[PDB]
Symmetry: C4
């Protein structure tokens, strides 16, 4: 009865500053990558205020970006991998006035400055090499 992928669901009330999203799943044993998108609308090539994108590669890293008017911006990356193949994780996004704060398994991970206004984000999209267990929205 776990959510199938791709997961795409509205954020109840829309995204607003002060909200958090909290995200339990498992990285697949053979994971290459997955993403979570804070999306502007329901369409499938919707703009994305915040794309959070762990990648196992040469350098295991997380990539962060925004898609606006259909175009990816300047990638930010952190060359650190807080997920592990085959392991359960807890992934939390907190929406602060200046940034999304990302916390993985209780460990602060990254702060991504807003590039598109928070109150454009209406949907959460999740897909890739993971199994999704729960998604809960808080404070909205």
């Amino acid at each position: 009865y776990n959510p199938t992928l791709p997961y795409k669901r509205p954020i109840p009330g829309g995204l607003s500053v002060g909200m958090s999203v909290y995200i339990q799943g498992m990285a697949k044993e053979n994971m290459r990558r997955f993403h979570v998108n804070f999306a502007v609308g329901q369409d499938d090539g919707a703009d994305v205020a915040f794309h959070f994108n762990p990648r196992f590669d040469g350098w295991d890293k997380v990539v962060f970006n925004t898609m606006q008017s259909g175009q990816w911006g300047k990638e930010e990356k952190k060359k650190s991998m807080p997920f592990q193949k085959g392991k359960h994780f807890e992934l939390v996004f907190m929406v602060m006035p200046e940034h999304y704060k990302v916390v993985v398994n209780g460990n602060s991970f990254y702060e991504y400055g807003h590039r598109l206004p928070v109150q454009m984000v209406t949907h959460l999209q999740v897909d890739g090499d993971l199994e999704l267990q729960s998604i809960n929205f808080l404070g909205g």
Copy 2:
């Protein structure tokens, strides 16, 4: 049917922290400069909480300033030009507690610390060497 210049319109409800303004237009092919003012009232020499002022010069740059009791303060500038002559742009201002954040074509550009209280800004004024397409206020 595009807006004529100078454009001067009230911000619905007044400016408040958490609001954004999003601004589509085109830099003219022969642009020297333009500005967007976050203005205190409707009069034509009203104070300006935030003047955003791209200038092609020797050094292509953006100038940022505040006019208070009729006098320009200390200019801030960034010696980088995110607009291009003859090209369409997307210009976003996000009103955070400490600053206006400016994002141009999806690329974070500048943070201008507040010098006059946000809740004095009642009007948006736009003028100069641009063609204006849309202005949308969000979160207010």
Copy 3:
């Protein structure tokens, strides 16, 4: 009909984050010092969340402090004097989540981190070598 000194008046609704105070007066020609206190209650030795205290001395400076349970804390100071003897000034305090931001004559001056919760401040007290013209509270 200008306000007499010491000036002590309630802040309508109490102080809250997002509020500003804006303060027109004149430094006296023979000014040594003055202060503005964000006070906890109406009594005369009330605690003070934020004491803003320009001083002409050897080093012309502004002193910033908090009085809690009747005791002054660690002074902060900036060795710069934005007022001038005999001159009119505009003094603005903006209450942000992390600090009071002080702006004098349109020029950002200082950010004083909160030491006592903002929602303890109920009164504004002003006294010293100045003539007071106007005090206006915004956003509360």
Copy 4:
């Protein structure tokens, strides 16, 4: 009639950004340590968004941590002791968007970045080598 220890009480309305907690007690003469927990629920091994934990040791210090899904995260510490054995103290926590700000006896002490969303904290727990006099919640 002072509160007995361990003290565990709900935060009226739940914790929210903008709230403060203010905490008068006395360090015991023979204090080794005490803590204040911002807890997620009433159970006794509840998760803890913020554990504030002064310790007299070799190095007198304060330890700060989060317990999530039953596990302590990466300790932060400050090798400074703002309490003193046998002395009364005033301990204030201010909940800002990015961090808890800790102020002890009027002196700013530490800012602890949020690791679990504020709006998960429902209870305050206090225990250890102290005598507790008052706990007051503000702005909620």
